[PDB]
Amino acid sequence: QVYISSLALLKMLKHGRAGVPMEVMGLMLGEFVDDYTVRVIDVFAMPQSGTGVSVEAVDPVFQAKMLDMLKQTGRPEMVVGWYHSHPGFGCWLSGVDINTQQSFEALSERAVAVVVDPIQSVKGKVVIDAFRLINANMMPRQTTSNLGHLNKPSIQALIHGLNRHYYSITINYRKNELEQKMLLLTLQDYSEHCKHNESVVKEMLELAKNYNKAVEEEDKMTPEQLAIKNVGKQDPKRHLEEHVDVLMTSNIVQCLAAM
Amino acid sequence: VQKVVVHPLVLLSVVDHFNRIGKVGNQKRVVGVLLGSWQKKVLDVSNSFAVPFDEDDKDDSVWFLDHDYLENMYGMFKKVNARERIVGWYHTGPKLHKNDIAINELMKRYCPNSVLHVTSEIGAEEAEEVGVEHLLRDIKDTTVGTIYQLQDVFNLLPDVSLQEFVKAFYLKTNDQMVVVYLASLIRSVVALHNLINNKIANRDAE
C-alpha cells in the first residue's frame, strides 16, 4: 500500500539516529492515486526544539519558504504528512496523537505519519509503520485475510490499545539497479608472517596439550553434555579450530598472490 | 591533509537528483553543494540544492546562484542541525573541464577539499548502514552467504634475478607451506574427532 523511495528511509534513519532520543520530527512529500497508496520520495527534516518538540515545529516560514525552495530546485508536488522518530521501545504514540491526529484533516485524509526506530534497529530491517485516523468511526479490502504480519506485532497491551486507533498497513520499497550495484597487498616478513606464525603455533602447542587433557578426561566419567560445555574455563578444542582457521586464510592466500 | 570518506546518503541523493533532471534532453553536469562536518577525513555528509544546470547545451561559460540560497539551505539547516560547513560539490559523470575548476575557484567561498586528486576513498557508512544493509537485497554484497612518470614506472619493474631473490622466495614459500601442512593436520584430527562423535552417537541410536 504505502510506498517509499528509500532515500526517505535513509534520510529518515539519518535524522532519527542523529538526534536520539529527542524525538526528532519532519514531514514528507508525495502524491495520491487511490485509498492509501502513498509514494514517498523525500522526507523534510523540520527543525528541533530544546528537548521537547511538538506542533510548534509546524512553522510558517521554514516549511512554507523551504517548501517553495525545494519546490523550485527539487521536489515539486504537495506534502503527504508528518513523521516521528521513537527511540528505544518501538511504536506507540500516546502524547504524539494529540499533536498529530488532529493535524491530518487540516490538510486532508490523504495524509499519513510514521514512527521509526533508529535504536533497536541495528539491523538492515528497520522498524517502519504508518497509520490511520481511527480516532472515531468504528463503523473493506479482502487483503488475502488481513495482511499477515499485523496479527504478529509485538503484541503488548498499551501498543495494541494504541493499535485500536493506529491500524498500520504496509511499507513497500523501491530501488534501482544503479544504486544497488554502487552499494554492493603484501606485508610479508616485515615482522608480520613470522610473528603471526611464531605466535599461533605456540597456542597450538599448549592448547593442544589442553586438548589432550580434554580427550583424556572426558573419555570416561562424562555425562550431561560435559556439564553443559564447560561454561567455566572456556574453551578447549574449539580454540584449536579457530587457530587453524586463522592462518590458513592468511598464510596461504595473500602469500598465494605473492606468486 | 587526509582523504575523503563516503556516506551513501549523498549518493542516493545525487542519484535521485539525476532521476529528477532526466527529462527530455538535458544530460547536464548538475552542480549542487554539500553540507556536513569538514575536518580530517570526512564526506561533507549531506547534499543541497542545485540551481539546475544549463549553459547553452554545451557552451559552458555561464553560472548559477544564489549565494543567499547557499545560506538558504545551508543557513536553515543550521536551525535543524549545527555541525556542518560547506566544502563538497558534485556534478554528473564522468566528464569535467574548466567549468568545474571555475566553480571550484569562482564559487569557492570555503571548499579547500572537495573531489566527488589524492583524496580518493569511498568510505564505510558509519552508524547508518542500517539504511544500507536493508537496501542491499537482491544480488547482495558478495552474495552474502558466499613521460617522466612512465619513465619512472619501469625503473622498479625488472626482477628475474633468482640468485639471491630467487633463493629467498623459494625459502619463504617452503616455510609457509610447512606451516599449512602442520595445520591442515590438526583440523583433520579434530574433524576426525567429530566423525567418531557422530558414529558413536548414531551407533548408540541403533
Binding site: 590458513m248 596461504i252 598465494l256 606468486m259 | 614459500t173 591442515s184
Partner: peptide, 8 residues
Amino acid sequence: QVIEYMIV
C-alpha cells in the same frame, strides 16, 4: 603452483 595452490 598458482594452479596447484578443496579447502572450502
